[model samples]
Target: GVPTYGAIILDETLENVLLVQGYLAKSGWGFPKGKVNKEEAPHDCAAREVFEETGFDIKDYICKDDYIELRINDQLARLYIIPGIPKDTKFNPKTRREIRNIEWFSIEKLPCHRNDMTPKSKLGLAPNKFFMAIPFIRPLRDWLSRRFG
Candidate 1:
């Protein structure tokens, strides 16, 4: 199975979720996730992808033990989480490559018309990639809060 890793960065405010606009695959509002680099651990890859995609240095944030797996194309993505991050940090999206935009949204109020499935389809992801993430999201978030809170 193809393996990928990414981080769900949480800010100190806990008011907004950080998401990246992809230049390669689907461009939508979601966590800062991406492929794992050669010879790198998933944890390292997650932190690196967050920086590469959203330009946030999250090495200091505590990573939760919980993870969520989503099948995209022929690959499986393992997304890790950090609950209640420290405030006073900003995310600047990478302009040169796959990232087009980086913005924050209220955790309870995300941007409208930004569906991950639709963008994955438009970006030519495999059928499995279009699966819904809602079912697993609550458990993941709850785990993160319980573990890190």
Candidate 2:
């Protein structure tokens, strides 16, 4: 899988994070990011993707060493943790065709994992709207505890 770069942007209060809603396959809500383009540096890709998805430039705020990385099915994704942005900041994606909507979600209210079908005795996790974003929730919480608390 091609390496992807993006960001988990948080407001100044650190209680909410920015999320974008894409169309179709990417219909679920998730962080602002995209795959790294050829010859592009990781930081550059992250900033580019975030700007395209949220209309907010994170270039000046991204800390070189602050990011959460994950690997699933041989694909690696890295999302820079950017905090302290104002909640009232305006965001408009480059195109509405790719993104359906953009909103700030409370971290504590977002699901960290999908639920299992214990009632039905099924063997799979239930469908969730935040599937794409769920993967980073637990890690983000832990990262915050260590960094701010």
Candidate 3:
């Protein structure tokens, strides 16, 4: 799988993060990101994908070393930490066909992981709107505390 890059944009209050909703396989809300283009740098890919998904340019705000990375099913995803963005900043996806909606969600309210259906003796994770973004929630919180709190 190709490597993915994007940004974890935090509002000025640092209590909310921007998320985007996509269709079908990527139907859940997640950070703005996509696979790196041929011969493209990670930072460039992150900025381009973010702009395509949220309309806001993150190129000027990205910090080379401030990022959270995760590997799942052989694919790697690196999301740059972009804090202090105003929540009121206007955003409109460059590709509406791929993005269903974009909005800010409270970090305190977001679930860090999916729930298990133990009552039904289920062994798998339950469906969740934030499933795509769940893997990074805990890490993001930790990063914020170590860096800001």
Candidate 4:
């Protein structure tokens, strides 16, 4: 099974919150993410995925070490948050690849659902049972309002 790393990159000017989008691979809405390339660290893979999928460079972005892991079937997935990235950077979705569309949603309004995740929920997997077990690891995203607001 391959390991995947994902990042929740937030922008505040659109409104103090993180942006989530629909992935072209599964056509499911999720935080920007990609599989870890051989010899690549998880964080590096995450940063690369952000740029590849969203076209936003986050080389200097500070990522929180806190992470969430889930084992569904045979795949193990990890997700984390990047505290800050240059907001001035423009977004040009890689149309030739796995990203079909993008949108910015307030963190408070996060966990939303598109046709991909489900029909009734927006919270995605973060609110799932496996995630609840690692309660302490989840950081207070609300701090983003003060930090970037």
TM-score on alpha carbons, each prediction: 0.66, 0.98, 0.98, 0.61
lDDT of 2 by residue, 4-107 (tens): 99999999999999999999999999998899988999999999999988899999999999999999679899999999999999999988889999999999
Q: In candidate 1, which residue pairs clash?
A: 12-85, 23-98
Better of 3 and 4 by TM-score: 3
What lDDT does candidate 2 reach at residue 18?
Answer: 94
Superposed Cα deviation of residue 95, candidate 1 (Å):
4.4
What's the lDDT of the predicted structure labeled candidate 2? 0.94
TM-score of 1: 0.66
lDDT string for model 4 (1-149, tens) is 88877666655443433343453335544566678899998878877877777787666763555455666578877766565444665677664366666555454444322223455665454333112112212233444444555
Q: Each candidate: what lDDT?
A: 0.62, 0.94, 0.97, 0.56
Q: What is the C-alpha RMSD of each candidate to the true structure, in Å?
A: 6.1, 0.6, 0.6, 7.0
Of the candidates numbered 1 and 3, which has the greater TM-score value? Answer: 3
Clash count, candidate 1:
2
Q: Over 4 Å off in model 3, which ranges?
A: none
User: Which parts of model 4 have CA positions greater than 4 angstroms off?
Assistant: 13-25, 84-89, 112-149
Better of 1 and 2 by lDDT: 2
Q: What's model 1's lDDT at 77?
A: 84
